Amino acid sequence: MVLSPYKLNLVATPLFLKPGIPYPIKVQVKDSLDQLVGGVPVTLNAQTIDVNQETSDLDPSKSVTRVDDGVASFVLNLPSGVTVLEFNVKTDAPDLPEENQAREGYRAIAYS
Amino acid sequence: VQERGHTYVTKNVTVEDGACVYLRNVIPNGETKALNNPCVLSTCYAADRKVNSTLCPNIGVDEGCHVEWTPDGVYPNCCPKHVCPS
């Protein structure tokens, strides 16, 4: 492997915050051969920025990629005045060191 | 010691006739009301012109699990449900 054996990609997760609707995040984990891999832990961290430039850190969430589609799912519930949601997903495979875990960051925006 | 329901504070809300007007939701002073939009549990403090709202808990889907959600109803019937067969 080089850097990491896993590649993270969002599926069915548009980076747009819709008001009054929960925000779902679905992450797929592939290998170097573009093959889905299940049973991989995925930890999600998030941070919200509102209209008053105030910052809120969420509690980390954990999911596992399924064996039928290699997808890990999260659902976040955000306050009403949130404009930006900066989140990141990282693998936590028990056979990989900390430095060799796949990590990816995304930024969802509210309408403007 | 995890926290499930997160709370936030909306400041500078409009106060009319002793009630908070929060996103077309009327909440009389010192009352706790379950809302549909947003799907939160709100409480008005008209003297400080603030509204304290509790959110639905965030869900991390486990193996063999899914999420059942509907926007209809007030809190907590509109919260996403972490449904795993049992």
Residue numbers in the entry:
A (entry chain E): 347 to 458
B (entry chain F): 2 to 87
Please give sentences taken from the publication describing this entry:
To understand the interaction between CirpT1 and C5 in greater detail, a complex of CirpT1 and C5_MG4 was crystallized. The structure of the C5_MG4–CirpT1 complex was solved by molecular replacement with the isolated C5_MG4 extracted from the C5–OmCI–RacI complex. Initial phases from the partial molecular replacement solution produced a map into which a model of CirpT1 was built de novo, and the complex refined to give the model described in Fig. 4A and Table 2. CirpT1 is made up of 2 domains: A bulky N-terminal domain and a flat looped C-terminal domain. The N terminus of CirpT1 extends further, however, and engages in a 4-stranded β-sheet. A detailed analysis of the binding interface was carried out using PDB-ePISA. This revealed an extensive interface that encompasses most of the C-terminal domain of the CirpT1, with additional contributions from the N-terminal strand and 2 residues at the tip of the extended loop in the N-terminal domain (Tyr23 and Leu24). The interface is predominantly hydrophobic in nature, with His7, Tyr23, and Asn59 on CirpT1 contributing sidechain hydrogen bonds (to Asp405, Ser426, and Asn423, respectively). Overlay of the C5_MG4–CirpT1 structure onto the C5–OmCI–RaCI–CirpT1 structure revealed minor clashes between CirpT1 and the neighboring C5_MG5 domain that were resolved by a small rigid body movement of the CirpT1 into the cryo-EM density. This placement of CirpT1 in the context of intact C5 revealed additional contacts between CirpT1 and C5_MG5, including a hydrophobic cleft between C5_MG4 and C5_MG5 that Trp70 and Pro72 of CirpT1 pack into. Of note, the stretch of residues from Cys66-Glu69 in CirpT1 extend over an extension of the hydrophobic crevice between C5_MG4 and C5_MG5, but leaving a hydrophobic hole.
The 3 pathways all converge at the activating cleavage of C3 into C3a and C3b, and the subsequent activating cleavage of C5 into C5a and C5b. C3b and its inactivated form iC3b function as opsonins for phagocytes, while C5b initiates the terminal pathway by assembly of the pore-forming membrane attack complex (MAC, C5b-C9). To address the need for a more detailed understanding of the mechanisms of C5 activation, we have identified and characterized a family of C5 inhibitors from tick saliva, hereafter named the CirpT (complement inhibitor from Rhipicephalus pulchellus of the terminal pathway) family. Analysis of the specific binding interactions between C5 and CirpT1 suggests that the CirpT family functions by direct steric blocking of the docking of C5 onto the C5-convertase, and our data thus provide support for previous models of C5 activation, which include convertase binding through C5 domains MG4, MG5, and MG7.
